[PDB]
Amino acid sequence: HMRTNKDRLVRISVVGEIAPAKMRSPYSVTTEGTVRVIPVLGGITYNVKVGDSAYGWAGDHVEPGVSVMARRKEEEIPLMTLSCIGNEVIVMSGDAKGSRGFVTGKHGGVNHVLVHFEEEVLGKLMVGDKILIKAWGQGLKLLDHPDVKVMNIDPDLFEKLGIQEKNGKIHVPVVAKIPAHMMGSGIGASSSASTDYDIMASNPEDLGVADLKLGDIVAIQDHDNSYGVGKYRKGAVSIGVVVHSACVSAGHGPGVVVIMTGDESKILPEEVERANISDYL
Amino acid sequence: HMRTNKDRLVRISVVGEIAPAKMRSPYSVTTEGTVRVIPVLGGITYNVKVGDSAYGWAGDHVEPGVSVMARRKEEEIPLMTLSCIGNEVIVMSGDAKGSRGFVTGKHGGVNHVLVHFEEEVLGKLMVGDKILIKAWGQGLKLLDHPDVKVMNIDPDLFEKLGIQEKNGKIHVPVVAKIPAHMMGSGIGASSSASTDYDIMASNPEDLGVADLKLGDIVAIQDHDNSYGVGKYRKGAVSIGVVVHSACVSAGHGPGVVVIMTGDESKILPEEVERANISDYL
Amino acid sequence: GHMRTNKDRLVRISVVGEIAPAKMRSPYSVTTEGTVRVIPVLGGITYNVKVGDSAYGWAGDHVEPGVSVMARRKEEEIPLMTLSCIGNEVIVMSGDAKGSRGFVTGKHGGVNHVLVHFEEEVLGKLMVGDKILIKAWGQGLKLLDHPDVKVMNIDPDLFEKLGIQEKNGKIHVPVVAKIPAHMMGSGIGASSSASTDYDIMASNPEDLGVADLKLGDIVAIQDHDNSYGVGKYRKGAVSIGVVVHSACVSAGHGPGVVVIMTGDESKILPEEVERANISDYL
Amino acid sequence: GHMRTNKDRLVRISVVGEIAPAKMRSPYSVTTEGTVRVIPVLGGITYNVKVGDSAYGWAGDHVEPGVSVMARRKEEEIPLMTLSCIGNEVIVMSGDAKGSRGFVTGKHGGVNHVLVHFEEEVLGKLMVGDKILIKAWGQGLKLLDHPDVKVMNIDPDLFEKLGIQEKNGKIHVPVVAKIPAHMMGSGIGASSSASTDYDIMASNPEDLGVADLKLGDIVAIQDHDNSYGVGKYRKGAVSIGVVVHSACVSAGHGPGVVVIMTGDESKILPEEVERANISDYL
Amino acid sequence: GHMRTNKDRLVRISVVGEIAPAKMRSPYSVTTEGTVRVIPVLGGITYNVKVGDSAYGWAGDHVEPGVSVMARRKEEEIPLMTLSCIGNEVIVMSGDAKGSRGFVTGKHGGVNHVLVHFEEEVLGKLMVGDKILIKAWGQGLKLLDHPDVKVMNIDPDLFEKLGIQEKNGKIHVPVVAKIPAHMMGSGIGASSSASTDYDIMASNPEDLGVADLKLGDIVAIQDHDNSYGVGKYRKGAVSIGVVVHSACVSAGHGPGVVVIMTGDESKILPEEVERANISDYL
Ligand SMILES: [Cl-]
Ligand SMILES: [Cl-]
Ligand SMILES: [Cl-]
Ligand SMILES: [Cl-]
Ligand SMILES: [Cl-]
Ligand SMILES: [Cl-]
Ligand SMILES: [Cl-]
Ligand SMILES: [Cl-]
Ligand SMILES: [Cl-]
Ligand SMILES: [Cl-]
Ligand SMILES: [Cl-]
Ligand SMILES: [Cl-]
Ligand SMILES: [Cl-]
Ligand SMILES: [Cl-]
């Protein structure tokens, strides 16, 4: 595997609490201009989890597993910025205390970090239980590929994604390559370190695949995400992880957290049948 | 049973706490313009339960069993929208921690979800104890009856109501058929998903029945509740569940949460002697 | 002449508010068919909808004719909404229209607005925030010969001009329409008919058997008693009211009615006529 | 003549705000190259940038032409941003320029400013905090013969002067540029195209195949439906918008566009011409 | 003539504040010697200390000459402090001196005040809380032939009058003193040199090898880079600034300096002269 500065990274406690189910209205507004009453984001979601399809749920912006929010507003930036996909998460109060899980993703706006625990643990969790995330990953650098930025990813998880260097190029398995024009909500966020942005496909076939799953690794064509999110640049490529379900409103759909960005000459995405972080929990 | 998208519905944690008895004034104003000092809504109500008469109590808007409110205002909409009659409820703090009950109803305005627990649990409960509702049911669809909307009901409970797809209609057992003109407070609420509305009958005999009980299934003639509450339309029909006691004030009476709505060419209410959710919970 | 009343014993009192902004809790209004529309809603100075115009046909929801008046603060809403009576004198007390006079045409519960008509030339001088004084007068009014007929929400001088006639112990009241109990929705169950309107939920006038319904029209509501709380169904009760705001797109809503009289059908006799509108008297 | 509309049914209503201060959440603006610049940003009376000027070339980020108008308080934001339409009459209601009249040029979401053009002589008299009245008019407009073509955010009188032509059932719209879906960024996903703009994320006009793009220019956005929410990619959809603020230094950002028409390419035919700017009619 | 700049592309924008009261967090000021004194501090209209006077010799601490201007609210502080440039035009917008014009002489971080000179007859009519309009112009200024020399915090018209001379690729700057890195104190570490001053922590002018140091003087700071954050030691860097407030009694504090130029010693050549004070050009 690739040379990194992993040993120089700071490992720090990032605190939050299990978020309630949130809804700003009973209605979700469709792209057809109709309204529907369906579940949305937040909470412990009992029957949707990393590995499941992002499509086909009667729900909007559904977050798999356990949604974690800040204790207060001032604690949001660090929660959303330092938490990396794959980081270890420990429940620190309530009946599941001491149980361990993994960060599967994060979602900007409401600012939730999303966590996979094993099935048995879910029944003992309660909204408000204290959550400790052992944040580790921001600051990571590929020592031999200085023009390839990495972010939002636990360095140990990073090594399990099947990425190979060959001839000063990085080969990255992905389930799908997403055109620039299919990206929507979240473009223009200040930092790709602290939010996801949306693939705005209503159906997976619109991306040319039979399914898109929570946890999938995808490529986003012609987007640089080095600082702010979603700069269109022909020849840019980003790699990301799918983190929340399909949405009903215009401009929204399955969220993606960027883990790698740079130029097509250095990053080579390779389509495979399966590339999903749940295989390496 | 009928074909539903049940396996596509999202099951999510909705939190609250046991609400105190609430009164904005010592007096309740009657429709005769007199004042009475009687108990009202909220709390743990020890001797009024789902299955009891909605009429004959020295009280106003009395909520059977345990009234559950939100931790805070922002959490009211999800509490009231996502909670469905029949959903499993777990006590998460205090002396009855671990005890399980069922949602019987919900009440808009104060925004309480109403919950039945076994008798032995009530004596251990305290105002402020934490409550978890495993919310499940909004989004439910009859796949062979697209113009019949269902809402506010746990899909397992729905299956037990004796509803049958017969002779090209959905037949629904109810204890009474309530004329449009007997509906009052709550008409015009933004969503039928997040509130009840009132049968404004002072006496069960005004509806042509000897009694109306908490938990009863009723039809409301000539009202559509597809989106907002209480649209008069000749030939619409709604089905609902009685959720709180009679009331003393003009335009108020036992509340009804809607569970089904559509046109009389598709829904046939069948008037029977007994149709009450407590028979299944 | 006119019905005997306790009008000299009524207290006349200063009720204060300010011109309300246009209000919207969402860009969208949700229709009874479950679709969304982006349209103007309530509050403000509404420049082109006034008492006398149709309640129907506007691309708007809950449109309030003329000038909407809100309380300075929450504690002041109950008296604003309770004491203000249709026909009461209103005076602008700050801004460029200072000194201009108008009349209360209605009031709308929920947001708690009192609605006011000024002459057209005043409107272009008004600004949201301008202080408003309502010389409130009417609540406590009684028909001394008809103790079982309650009146409310109406300036006693305007009440005398409505063409209401007492004849052989019965009160004849000109109305443009007789609305069945089942056509009433939002507002039923409000704590007091003295402090709110409630909605005729007809999408179209034709649903009420009339070709048009106007802002300012006097209507009967059949089988509703409004003596204390709003909208008690009672077979044989009748209420008389004034239309105060425009039609609505959402389920259970429609042109608002403020009740001015309520009692039994043996005593109140609505007579359906071609015209009955408060704009003719102010 | 002009396309048939429901314009006589539209409600015209007072929408209030105040001149916003210049706003900056940090001294620094972060570039797409990951460096920092200290430059002016949004809000205020901007004395030397106006509708008709280039959107590019300013040492500024998200610069708003003319006078930026904000809500008096949070609850008044939705109506300010939803009901205010490009072209609507604006009147200064306090301070030294009281009585001065201008026009809405645009609006900008997030900070929620409505953007207003006044004549140059006025600008020097304005002060942050001066009360502003927008005679809001236009949401709800419908093309009665083109029900699948949605119009929005535009004063009906201005709409009639834009050079739009109905010929053989198709609507021809002059535009200065046709922008591909993928050049659109910040704002995609906004809840309603009625209450915000969204960004053309081009660092240089040349990235759009044109030499300049001006504040007030009418543009086409290819393959975006904006009927309800903002920025739905759909092949064959077309949207027409007005450029309303300056270029930006950060990733995903750029001159903002307020949508004024959206529908299908079979009905809306954008025609690229040498000039199409609302400043010519204001 | 003048150095080539991007001045035509700079955004000029309304920056609002109000006249600050005199501020004291305690009756006492703590000296470097560990004793306390009761003396006037910052804020207010200071009637007898003005740009051009000595920064030393006052029985006071952190005294701000002329009129101190603060934000209306905290959200407004960053733009007040960032965009306001020394030399910018200032207009009084309420009170008895309404219409009077003055000039920004400086700005002081922490309390976050912008300091302003009006002519003497104006001061007597001013009141704490009077509204103030700063026509902010100058952030974003670039020297187009000297890309590694950064300028900031200065009105481009004032900049052109300071007697700076480009000669053979080098910038000669008249200064009254050259201050070594180690004499700079409070403020080092501030996030941006665009929004704050920092302190020459000399308790006496003689500690800098000069007989006096005046409010308004131009000085060089040796071996400090102020390109981004304040006060980076770097051997060979040079910064130029303006003295903006009086001497101070506490450890680490002293007359404040707003940086106006920063870069390398091979490009910026400070020339120590007898007089170099911005009061000569207002
Ligand atoms: Cl999961
Ligand atoms: Cl590289
Ligand atoms: Cl119960
Ligand atoms: Cl059907
Ligand atoms: Cl009926
Ligand atoms: Cl009117
Ligand atoms: Cl009587
Ligand atoms: Cl009826
Ligand atoms: Cl302008
Ligand atoms: Cl069409
Ligand atoms: Cl495209
Ligand atoms: Cl001075
Ligand atoms: Cl240089
Ligand atoms: Cl030194």
Q: Residue B242 corresponds to which amino acid?
A: V
User: Are the C-beta atoms of residues C43 and C62 closer than 8 Å to each other?
Assistant: no
* Apex D95 CA angle, D92 and D97, nearest 5: 55
Whole-angstrom Cα distance, residue C207 to residue C202? 6
Whole-angstrom Cα distance, residue B90 to residue E197? 59
Residues after which a C–N gap over 2.5 Å breaks chain E: none
Looking at the structure, tell me whether residues A237 and A171 fall in a common domain.
yes
User: Are the C-beta atoms of residues C21 and C44 closer than 8 Å to each other?
Assistant: yes
Looking at the structure, tell me whether residues E76 and E201 fall in a common domain.
no
Looking at the structure, tell me whether residues C191 and C279 fall in a common domain.
yes
User: Are the C-beta atoms of residues E270 and E218 closer than 8 Å to each other?
Assistant: no
Backbone phi and psi for residue D34, each to the nearest 5 degrees, phi listed first: 75, 30
User: Are the C-beta atoms of residues B95 and B51 closer than 8 Å to each other?
Assistant: no
Total Cβ atoms within 10 A of residue C182:
20
Q: Residue A112: which of A43, A28, A25, A158 has the closest Cα? A: A43
- What are the residues whose beta carbons fall under 8 Å from the beta carbon of C145, sequence distance 6 or more? C3, C4, C166
Characterize B168-180 residue by residue with b for buried, 16 or more Cβ atoms within 10 angstroms of its Cβ, and e for exposed.
Answer: eebebbbbbbbbb
Q: Residue E153: which of E71, E218, E68 has the closest Cα? A: E218
* Chain A: touching chains (3 or more CB pairs < 8 Å): B, C, D
Total number of domains in chain A: 3
Q: Any idea which residue has 């109990």 for tokens?
A: C181
Q: Residue C69: which of C127, C121, C17 has the closest Cα? A: C17
> Mind telling me how many Å the CA of D86 is from chain E's nearest CA?
23
Whole-angstrom Cα distance, residue A51 to residue E224? 55
Residue D239 vs residues D184, D216, D268: alpha-carbon distances, Å:
12, 16, 8
Whole-angstrom Cα distance, residue B176 to residue B219? 6
Residue A281 vs residues A11, A160, A274, A277: alpha-carbon distances, Å:
20, 10, 15, 7
- Ligand index nearest the alpha carbon of residue E237: 14
For chain B, the farthest-separated pair of C-alpha atoms sits apart, in whole angstroms, at 53
- Which tokens go with D93? 């209601």
- Which tokens go with E14? 């309304």
Whole-angstrom Cα distance, residue E199 to residue B154? 69
- What are the residues whose beta carbons fall under 8 Å from the beta carbon of B240, sequence distance 6 or more? B196, B217, B218, B219, B220, B225, B256, B257, B258, B259
Whole-angstrom Cα distance, residue E38 to residue C27? 58
Ligand 11 centroid – CA A203 distance (Å): 18
Across the interface, whether the CB atoms of C230 and B222 are under 8 A apart is answered no
DSSP assignment of A231-279:
EEEEEEEEEEEE-S---SSTT--SEEEEEEEEETTTEEEEE-S--BGGG
Report resolution (Å) to 1 decimal. Answer: 2.4
| E182 secondary structure, DSSP code | G
E165-167 β-sheet, strand order: E165-167, E170-175, E268-272
Q: What value does the CA radius of gyration of chain E take, rounded to a whole number of Å?
A: 18
Residue A193 vs residues A77, A107, A149, A189, A197: alpha-carbon distances, Å:
10, 11, 11, 10, 11
The separation between CA E234 and the C-alpha centre of its own chain, rounded to angstroms, equals: 22
C55 interaction partners in chain D (CB closer than 8 Å): none
Across the interface, whether the CB atoms of B188 and C253 are under 8 A apart is answered yes
> Mind telling me how many Å the CA of B18 is from chain C's nearest CA?
27
Classify the phi-psi angles of A208: left when phi > 0, otherwise alpha if psi is within -120 to 50, otherwise beta.
Answer: left
Chain D residue with the nearest C-alpha to that of C246: D11
Q: D51 is in which domain, residue-wise?
A: 26-64
Looking at the structure, tell me whether residues C161 and C208 fall in a common domain.
yes
List, in sequence order, the alpha helices (H) in A176-239. none
- Ligand index nearest the alpha carbon of residue C103: 6
Ligand 3 centroid – CA B185 distance (Å): 23
Count of alpha carbons within 13 Å of C120, Cβ hemisphere only?
A: 3
Ligand 13 centroid – CA E266 distance (Å): 9
Characterize E137-152 residue by residue with b for buried, 16 or more Cβ atoms within 10 angstroms of its Cβ, and e for exposed.
Answer: bbbbbbbeebeebbbb
Q: Residue B139 corresponds to which amino acid?
A: G
Residue B174 vs residues B171, B213, B231, C206: alpha-carbon distances, Å:
10, 12, 20, 33
Looking at the structure, tell me whether residues C21 and C157 fall in a common domain.
no
Q: What share of chain D is helix, strand, coil (3-state, %, to 5)?
A: 10, 40, 50
> Mind telling me how many Å the CA of A40 is from chain B's nearest CA?
9
Whole-angstrom Cα distance, residue B52 to residue C100? 60
Q: Residue A253: which of A190, A163, A193, A176 has the closest Cα? A: A176
Residue E258 vs residues B261, E60, E194, E275: alpha-carbon distances, Å:
71, 20, 8, 18
Q: Residue E139: which of E1, E7, E228, E229 has the closest Cα? A: E7
Reduce the DSSP state of residue D82 to 3 states and report it: helix
User: Are the C-beta atoms of residues D281 and D252 closer than 8 Å to each other?
Assistant: no
Query: Residue D250 is nearest to which of A184, A225, A228, comparing CB atoms?
Result: A228
Looking at the structure, tell me whether residues A249 and A115 fall in a common domain.
no
Q: Which of A24, A30, A35 to mutate to test the interface with C (most CBs of C within 10 A)?
A: A35
Reduce the DSSP state of residue E156 to 3 states and report it: helix
Sign, Cα dihedral of E157, E161, E166, E167: positive
Characterize B39-50 residue by residue with b for buried, 16 or more Cβ atoms within 10 angstroms of its Cβ, and e for exposed.
Answer: bbbbbbbeebbb
Reduce the DSSP state of residue C83 to 3 states and report it: helix
Q: Residue A105: which of A278, A237, A225, A256 has the closest Cα? A: A256
Q: Residue A26: which of E175, C11, B108, E209 has the closest Cα? A: B108
Q: Residue C69 corresponds to which amino acid?
A: V
> Mind telling me how many Å the CA of A170 is from chain B's nearest CA?
38
Residue C13 vs residues C115, C140, C188: alpha-carbon distances, Å:
18, 13, 28
CATH of the domain at C48: 4.10.1180.10
User: Are the C-beta atoms of residues D46 and E83 closer than 8 Å to each other?
Assistant: no
DSSP assignment of E106-122:
EEETTTTEEEEE--HHH
Looking at the structure, tell me whether residues B45 and B93 fall in a common domain.
no
Total Cβ atoms within 10 A of residue A118:
10
Whole-angstrom Cα distance, residue A2 to residue A18? 35
E72 interaction partners in chain D (CB closer than 8 Å): 21
A127 interaction partners in chain B (CB closer than 8 Å): 13, 15, 132
Q: Residue C269 corresponds to which amino acid?
A: L
Number of residues written out for chain D: 282
Residue that terminates a domain, selected from B140, B171, B203: B140
- Which tokens go with A204? 């997976």
Residue that terminates a domain, selected from C141, C159, C182: C141
Looking at the structure, tell me whether residues A267 and A185 fall in a common domain.
yes
Residue E265: exposure state from Cβ atoms within 10 A (0-12, 13-18, ≥19): middle
Whole-angstrom Cα distance, residue E222 to residue E265? 9
Characterize B244-275 residue by residue with b for buried, 16 or more Cβ atoms within 10 angstroms of its Cβ, and e for exposed.
Answer: bbbbbbbbbbbbbbbbbbbeeeebbbeeeeeb
Across the interface, whether the CB atoms of E13 and D46 are under 8 A apart is answered yes
D13 interaction partners in chain C (CB closer than 8 Å): 22, 40, 43-47
Characterize D22-58 residue by residue with b for buried, 16 or more Cβ atoms within 10 angstroms of its Cβ, and e for exposed.
Answer: bbbeebbbbbbeeeebbbbbbbbbbbbbbbbbbbbeb
| B225 secondary structure, DSSP code | -
Reduce the DSSP state of residue C78 to 3 states and report it: helix
Residue that terminates a domain, selected from E88, E111, E141: E141
User: Are the C-beta atoms of residues D220 and D210 closer than 8 Å to each other?
Assistant: no
Q: Which of A60, A220, A227, A233 to mutate to test the interface with D (most CBs of D within 10 A)?
A: A227
Looking at the structure, tell me whether residues A244 and A272 fall in a common domain.
yes
- What are the residues whose beta carbons fall under 8 Å from the beta carbon of D254, sequence distance 6 or more? D185, D186, D199, D200, D201, D202, D203, D247, D248
Count of alpha carbons within 13 Å of A116, Cβ hemisphere only?
A: 22
- What are the residues whose beta carbons fall under 8 Å from the beta carbon of B214, sequence distance 6 or more? B48, B49, B50, B51, B52, B53, B54, B64, B104, B105, B242, B243, B244, B245, B254, B278
Query: Residue A31 is nearest to which of D182, D229, D253, comparing CB atoms?
Result: D229
DSSP assignment of B58-118:
SSSSPPPEEEEE-SSGGGHHHHHHH--BT-EEEE-SSTTTT-EEEEEEEETTTTEEEEE--
Whole-angstrom Cα distance, residue C107 to residue C87? 11
B191 interaction partners in chain A (CB closer than 8 Å): 26-27, 37
Beta-carbon contacts below 8 Å between D and E: 95
Whole-angstrom Cα distance, residue C112 to residue C258? 13
- Ligand index nearest the alpha carbon of residue B244: 3
Strand partners, D165: D172
CATH of the domain at D190: 2.102.30.10
Element (H, E) at D80: helix D77-83
Interface of E with D (CB under 8 A): 6, 9-16, 72, 75-76, 78-79, 81-83, 93, 131, 133, 135-136, 139-142, 152, 191-192, 194-195, 228
The separation between CA D151 and the C-alpha centre of its own chain, rounded to angstroms, equals: 14
Q: Residue A89: which of A16, A31, A168, A9 has the closest Cα? A: A16
User: Are the C-beta atoms of residues D117 and D65 closer than 8 Å to each other?
Assistant: yes
Strand partners, E174: E271
Q: Residue A85: which of A230, A211, A252, A239 has the closest Cα? A: A239
* Chain E: touching chains (3 or more CB pairs < 8 Å): D
Whole-angstrom Cα distance, residue E213 to residue E245? 11
A57 interaction partners in chain B (CB closer than 8 Å): 8-10
Whole-angstrom Cα distance, residue B106 to residue B195? 6
Q: What value does the CA radius of gyration of chain A take, rounded to a whole number of Å?
A: 18
Looking at the structure, tell me whether residues E131 and E259 fall in a common domain.
no
Residue E172 vs residues D99, E224, E239: alpha-carbon distances, Å:
51, 18, 12
Looking at the structure, tell me whether residues E110 and E134 fall in a common domain.
yes
Strand partners, D208: none
Looking at the structure, tell me whether residues A6 and A145 fall in a common domain.
yes
Chain C residue with the nearest C-alpha to that of D153: C38
Q: Residue E80 corresponds to which amino acid?
A: L
- What are the residues whose beta carbons fall under 8 Å from the beta carbon of B41, sequence distance 6 or more? B21, B22, B60, B61, B62, B63, B67, B107, B110, B112, B244
Q: What share of chain A is helix, strand, coil (3-state, %, to 5)?
A: 10, 35, 50
Whole-angstrom Cα distance, residue A143 to residue A137? 15
Reduce the DSSP state of residue B156 to 3 states and report it: helix
Count of alpha carbons within 13 Å of E184, Cβ hemisphere only?
A: 30
Total Cβ atoms within 10 A of residue C167:
8
Whole-angstrom Cα distance, residue C246 to residue C254? 7
Whole-angstrom Cα distance, residue D33 to residue E96? 49
